[PDB]
Amino acid sequence: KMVYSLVSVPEGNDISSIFELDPTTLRGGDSLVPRNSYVRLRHL
Amino acid sequence: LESTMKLVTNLSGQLSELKDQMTEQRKQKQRIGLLGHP
Amino acid sequence: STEYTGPESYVAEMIRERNLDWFPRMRAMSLVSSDSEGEQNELRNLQEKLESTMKLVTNLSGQLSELKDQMTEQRKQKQRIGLLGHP
Ligand SMILES: [Ca+2]
């Protein structure tokens, strides 16, 4: 199912607006994010 | 023998950096356990 | 001139130019029995650049060790202030 859907909220100090970034290849966690790399968005 | 130093110094460096990456992943795990579970 | 090779063309244009610099003067390839002596220079450059690589790797090893030690020291500081500060 679709438990949650993306919306736009006016305040940005909440915890519901924060996201986690997931790479598409084998990239180290401490490495810098390349400028134009494909990624996956995970809601923290 | 300086090539042997190449080998031994390289192994020392990789062991040190893997130790550091376990340290960094421990820090990452504790930070996500603290921030993620307030 | 149709089927001159490399050296033949060189010599032909030298003798047309009225030049005699293509003769070997006080030189002979048999006398210079020294083979490629650039191997020693390559070895010296190899050892120098590779000791610079040891500079880099040894420096990174030292900084990693000292940062490990400074986490150890701050852990000791934190435990000492948690023990003395909370008796
Ligand atoms: Ca020809």
UniProtKB/Swiss-Prot annotation, chain A:
- The organism sits in which domain of life? Eukaryota
On modification after translation, the UniProt record reads: Polyubiquitinated. Polyubiquitination targets ITPR1 for proteasomal degradation. Approximately 40% of the ITPR1-associated ubiquitin is monoubiquitin, and polyubiquitins are both 'Lys-48'- and 'Lys-63'-linked. Phosphorylation by cAMP kinase (PKA) enhances calcium release. Phosphorylation by PKA increases the interaction with inositol 1,4,5-trisphosphate and decreases the interaction with AHCYL1.
The record's subcellular location field reads: Endoplasmic reticulum membrane; Cytoplasmic vesicle, Secretory vesicle membrane; Cytoplasm, Perinuclear region
Under the subunit heading, UniProt states:
Homotetramer. Homodimer. Interacts with ERP44 in a pH-, redox state- and calcium-dependent manner which results in the inhibition the calcium channel activity. The strength of this interaction inversely correlates with calcium concentration. Part of cGMP kinase signaling complex at least composed of ACTA2/alpha-actin, CNN1/calponin H1, PLN/phospholamban, PRKG1 and ITPR1. Interacts with IRAG1. Interacts with CABP1 (via N-terminus). Interacts with TESPA1.
Functional description taken from the UniProt entry: Inositol 1,4,5-trisphosphate-gated calcium channel that, upon inositol 1,4,5-trisphosphate binding, mediates calcium release from the endoplasmic reticulum (ER). Undergoes conformational changes upon ligand binding, suggesting structural flexibility that allows the channel to switch from a closed state, capable of interacting with its ligands such as 1,4,5-trisphosphate and calcium, to an open state, capable of transferring calcium ions across the ER membrane. Cytoplasmic calcium released from the ER triggers apoptosis by the activation of CAMK2 complex.
Domain comment text? The ITPR1 structure has a large solenoid CY assembly built around the central helical bundle made of the C-terminal domains from four ITPR1 subunits. The solenoid scaffold includes domains responsible for binding of ligands and regulatory proteins and is connected via an allosteric nexus at the cytosolic-membrane interface to the transmembrane channel assembly. Six transmembrane helices from each subunit form the central ion-conduction pore.
User: What family does this belong to?
Assistant: Belongs to the InsP3 receptor family.
The protein depicted here goes by the name Inositol 1,4,5-trisphosphate-gated calcium channel ITPR1
Give the species: Rattus norvegicus
Lineage, opening ranks: Eukaryota, Metazoa, Chordata, Craniata, Vertebrata
Within the intact protein, the region shown is 350 to 393 of 2750
UniProtKB/Swiss-Prot annotation, chain C:
Record's comment on post-translational modification: Polyubiquitinated. Polyubiquitination targets ITPR1 for proteasomal degradation. Approximately 40% of the ITPR1-associated ubiquitin is monoubiquitin, and polyubiquitins are both 'Lys-48'- and 'Lys-63'-linked. Phosphorylation by cAMP kinase (PKA) enhances calcium release. Phosphorylation by PKA increases the interaction with inositol 1,4,5-trisphosphate and decreases the interaction with AHCYL1.
* Chain intervals for the UniProt region annotation (Disordered): 71-87
Q: Which sites bind Ca(2+) 2?
A: 2
Q: Where in the cell is it found?
A: Endoplasmic reticulum membrane; Cytoplasmic vesicle, Secretory vesicle membrane; Cytoplasm, Perinuclear region
| Similarity section | Belongs to the InsP3 receptor family.
Its UniProt domain note says: The ITPR1 structure has a large solenoid CY assembly built around the central helical bundle made of the C-terminal domains from four ITPR1 subunits. The solenoid scaffold includes domains responsible for binding of ligands and regulatory proteins and is connected via an allosteric nexus at the cytosolic-membrane interface to the transmembrane channel assembly. Six transmembrane helices from each subunit form the central ion-conduction pore.
Subunit details = Homotetramer. Homodimer. Interacts with ERP44 in a pH-, redox state- and calcium-dependent manner which results in the inhibition the calcium channel activity. The strength of this interaction inversely correlates with calcium concentration. Part of cGMP kinase signaling complex at least composed of ACTA2/alpha-actin, CNN1/calponin H1, PLN/phospholamban, PRKG1 and ITPR1. Interacts with IRAG1. Interacts with CABP1 (via N-terminus). Interacts with TESPA1.
Q: What does this protein do?
A: Inositol 1,4,5-trisphosphate-gated calcium channel that, upon inositol 1,4,5-trisphosphate binding, mediates calcium release from the endoplasmic reticulum (ER). Undergoes conformational changes upon ligand binding, suggesting structural flexibility that allows the channel to switch from a closed state, capable of interacting with its ligands such as 1,4,5-trisphosphate and calcium, to an open state, capable of transferring calcium ions across the ER membrane. Cytoplasmic calcium released from the ER triggers apoptosis by the activation of CAMK2 complex.
In Swiss-Prot or TrEMBL terms, this protein is called Inositol 1,4,5-trisphosphate-gated calcium channel ITPR1
This chain's source organism reads Rattus norvegicus (Rat)
Kindly list the organism's lineage: Eukaryota, Metazoa, Chordata, Craniata, Vertebrata
Q: Which gene encodes it?
A: Itpr1
Give the shown range, full length included: 2653 to 2739 of 2750
